[PDB]
C-alpha cells in the first residue's frame with residue numbers, strides 16, 4: 001500500500017503487473033490525467049517559454065553513451081540492448097539533443113536554443129528502491145535542454161524558475177513554503193575539471209541567491225555532468241521529493257564537441273542547461289494524489305461531473321439527464337463521416353442510473369470525487385433546470401440550464417480551476 | 418524516400434544519425450506534423466469511435482512473449498534487454514499482449530463489450546539493415562494502435578466501424594484511394610486450423626458486404642490471425658501497407674481471457690487489432706510523397722509569412738508585428754499568466770530580411786507557406802493586409818487582422 005494505491009483503486013487510475021515490474025499501466029482514467037498534464041506543459045513551453053519539442057530515439061549505440069559518460073558513470077541505472085554492436089536504452093534525453101545541436105551549423109542568433117522532449121525514459125532501478133509512481137523503471141519527463149551563451153544563463157534559469165513558480169505556486173499549490181531548493185554540488189563520480197566545476201557552482205549559487213528562493217546545501221549530490229537546483233516538495237509524511245530540477249552543464253558540450261559561430265566570428269562552446277518542471281509526469285502526479293487525496297480540480301478530474309436522476313425509472317427525468325450528458329460529452333456518431341473538429345470542448349460527465357437510493361448514489365459520487373454533482377427530480381423536470389452542486393460544498397446547490405452548465409464548465413478549464 | 422529527404426531539408430522536418438540506425442529524429446517542424454496527426458486521430462478515436470487510450474510498458478519479461486507467441490515468431494525482429502535472478506526482457510514490437518493483461522486484470526462482463534483500447538506507444542522491431550527505408554520502414558515507430566474485445570455477434574459491426582474511420586482518413590481528410598489485401602493464414606501460424614478457417618470465412622463476408630476493392634494476398638497474414646491490409650500506391654505505383662484490420666482468435670486463448678455472458682456463462686472475447694495510419698511515420702512519408710511539401714493549412718509547419726515591402730519602414734513593421742503577435746497568440750515569459758487550454762496558435766513567420774520583396778516571396782514559395790501576407794504603404798493606409806494562397810498566384814485579398822484570424826481558425830475547424 002503506497003502513496004497512490006487507494007485513489008488508484010477508487011478511480012481506476014493505474015495498474016501493476018509482475019510481467020513488467022517498475023513499469024506500469026495507465027488505465028483510461030489514469031491516462032487522461034497523464035495526457036492533460038502534458039497538454040498543459042506543452043502549452044506553457046511552446047507558447048510562453050519558447051521551447052521547441054523534438055522526438056528522439058530511445059536506443060543508441062554504446063559509443064554515444066561513452067561520449068556522454070553515461071556508459072561508465074551511469075552504468076548502474078542503464079539498460080543494455082542486444083540482438084555485434086551493443087546498444088543502450090536511454091535513461092536521459094540530453095545526448096540525443098546534443099546530436100540535434102551538432103547536426104547543423106549553429107549561429108549565436110539561434111541562441112538560446114531550447115528543445116523539449118516527452119520521451120519515455122528507462123532507468124534500471126533496484127527492486128527495493130521501486131515505489132509507486134514516485135520511483136519507476138519507466139517514466140516520462142517534461143524534459144528540456146537549453147543551449148545558450150554565458151550572458152544568457154542567468155535569464156534562462158530565471159525563466160525556468162518562473163515556469164516552476166506558475167506550476168508549484170499558482171496552478172498546483174501543495175507564494176512560498178511550497179518548495180525549497182537543494183543546491184546539489186559536485187558528486188564523487190563526475191566528469192571534467194575542478195576549475196570548470198567550481199566555476200559552474202559559483203554561477204549557479206550566484207543565481208540561486210538572486211532568486212531569493214528558500215534553499216539549503218545538498219553536498220555531493222549533483223549530476224556527473226553538472227551541479228543542480230533541485231526543487232523539493234514535502235509530502236503528508238514530511239518526506240521530501242525531488243521534482244523540478246535545473247542543471248548547469250559545461251561538460252557534455254565538450255564531450256560532444258559542440259560549437260557555435262559567435263559575434264567575433266569564432267567558435268565557442270554553448271552552455272547546456274538541463275531542466276524539467278514536473279520532473280516526471282508520474283512522480284509529480286503521485287504527489288498531487290498525496291495532497292488532494294483524489295479531490296482533483298475540474299480541469300484535471302477524470303470524473304468531472306455525474307448526473308443523478310432521483311427516480312431511475314422516470315422517463316421524464318431520464319430524457320433530461322441523457323440530453324445534458326450528450327451535450328457535455330460532445331461526441332459524434334460512428335454512423336456518419338463528420339470528423340471531430342479541433343479545439344472543441346468535451347467533458348467527462350457520467351450518468352448514475354443504478355437502481356439504488358438517490359442518497360447512496362450521491363455518497364458514491366463524492367467518494368469517487370466527482371467535481372460536480374447534478375441531480376434531477378420532478379421540480380427540475382418542471383423548471384427544466386438542473387440542480388448542480390460542488391463536490392467540496394454541499395450548500396453550493398444552484399439551478400442552471402443546459403447552456404449555463406456548458407458555459408460554466410468551459411470557464412473552469414479556461415481558468416485552470 | 419528521397420522526396421521525403423528533399424522536403425525534410427527544405428522544411429527542417431527529420432534527421433538521422435548512425436548512432437541509431439532505423440530510428441528517426443523529429444526536428445521541431447517535423448514533430449509538429451507528428452503531433453497534429455496524433456491529435457487528429459485521438460479526437461476521432463475518443464469522441465466518435467468509443468476508444469480508450471492507455472499507456473503500457475515498453476519492456477516485458479521473456480515470459481509474456483512466450484505466452485503471446487512473439488518470442489518464437491519475432492525474436493529476430495525483436496530487441497532484448499539485459500537486467501540484473503536473471504530474467505531477460507523484451508522491447509515490445511507490438512502492443513497487443515500488454516492489452517490482454519489489462520482485459521484480464523478485472524473480471525469482465527458482456528456489458529463492457531465492445532471494449533476498445535488505443536495506444537500510441539513507440540514500437541521497436543529489429544528490421545534488416547537493407548530493409549530500412551526513410552520513414553516507410555524503421556526500427557522505431559509509433560502506431561495509432563487499437564484493440565477491440567467483443568462478442569462474435571459484434572465483430573461485423575465493429576470491423577465496419579473501423580472501416581468507417583479508414584474511409585475518413587483516406588477518402589475525406591487525406592485523399593478508390595485504397596484497396597484491401599486479404600492476407601490469409603501464414604505458414605508459421607499458431608492455433609487450431611479449424612478456428613482459422615472460420616475466422617477467414619467471417620472476415621470474407623465482412624469484406625464482401627463492404628463493397629470495397631480487394632485482392633487475395635495469401636500466406637501473408639499474422640500468425641495470430643488473418644488481416645485486412647489497406648494498400649496505398651506511390652507515384653511510382655508501388656504499394657504500401659498502412660491501415661490494417663486483424664482478426665484474432667488466438668491471443669485470447671493464449672492468455673485465457675474470459676468474460677461473463679448474459680446467461681452467466683464464461684466465454685472468450687474476440688480480439689481485433691487495428692491501426693488507421695498504420696504507423697505515423699510511414700503515413701507521414703506517404704503524405705510527403707504525395708504533396709511534395711505542399712501541406713494543408715492545418716498540417717503546415719509554415720502556415721503563413723508576413724512580408725513588409727520596406728523593412729525599414731516603422732509603420733509597416735508595426736502593422737506586421739501586430740498581426741504576427743495576434744496570429745501566434747503567445748504570452749510573455751516574465752509574468753505568471755498561464756497559456757489557457759483550447760486557444761488558437763498559428764505558425765506565422767516574419768520576413769524582415771534586407772532583400773527585395775520579390776526575393777522574399779520566392780523564398781516562401783519554396784518553403785511552401787500556405788499563405789503569404791504582404792504589407793506596403795498601400796496596405797498601411799488601408800489598415801488591411803494583402804494575403805494570397807500558396808497554390809493560386811492570383812488569389813490576393815485584402816483582409817483585416819480579425820478576418821485573417823477567423824479565416825485561419827475556420828481552416829483549422831475544417832481540416833483544410
Ligand SMILES: Nc1ncnc2c1ncn2[C@@H]1O[C@H](COS(=O)(=O)NC(=O)[C@@H](N)CO)[C@@H](O)[C@H]1O
Pocket residue numbers: 091092093094123125133134135136137139141143144242243244245274275276278279280282283
Ligand atoms: N526512477 C524515477 N521514477 C520517477 N521519476 C523520476 C525517477 N528518476 C528521476 N525522476 C524525476 O525526473 C526528474 C529528473 O531527473 S534527473 O535525473 O535528476 N534529471 C535528468 O535526468 C535530466 N535528463 C534532466 O533534463 C527528477 O527530479 C524526478 O522528478
Ligand SMILES: Nc1ncnc2c1ncn2[C@@H]1O[C@H](COS(=O)(=O)NC(=O)[C@@H](N)CO)[C@@H](O)[C@H]1O
Pocket residue numbers: 358359360362363366391392393394
Ligand atoms: N459533501 C459530502 N461529503 C461526504 N458525504 C456527503 C456529502 N454530501 C452528501 N453526503 C452523504 O450523502 C448522503 C446523502 O445525504 S443527503 O444530503 O441527505 N441527500 C440529499 O440531500 C438528496 N439525496 C436529496 O434530494 C448521506 O449519506 C450524506 O452523508
Ligand SMILES: Nc1ncnc2c1ncn2[C@@H]1O[C@H](COS(=O)(=O)NC(=O)[C@@H](N)CO)[C@@H](O)[C@H]1O
Pocket residue numbers: 510511512513542544552553554555556557558560562563658659660661690691692694695696698699
Ligand atoms: N518497420 C516499420 N516502420 C514503419 N511502419 C511500420 C513498420 N512495421 C509496420 N509498420 C506500420 O504499422 C502497421 C501495423 O503493423 S502490423 O504489423 O501489420 N500490425 C501490428 O503489429 C499489430 N500490433 C496491430 O494492432 C503497418 O500496416 C505499417 O503501416
Ligand SMILES: Nc1ncnc2c1ncn2[C@@H]1O[C@H](COS(=O)(=O)NC(=O)[C@@H](N)CO)[C@@H](O)[C@H]1O
Pocket residue numbers: 774775776778779782791807808809810
Ligand atoms: N506560385 C508561384 N510559383 C512559382 N513562383 C512564384 C509563384 N508566385 C510568385 N512567384 C515568383 O516570385 C517572384 C515575385 O512575383 S511577383 O508576384 O511578381 N512579385 C510582386 O508582385 C512583388 N514584387 C510586389 O508585391 C517572381 O519571380 C515570381 O515568378
Ligand SMILES: [Zn+2]
Pocket residue numbers: 092093094145274275
Ligand atoms: Zn538532461
Ligand SMILES: [Zn+2]
Pocket residue numbers: 511512513564690691
Ligand atoms: Zn495488435
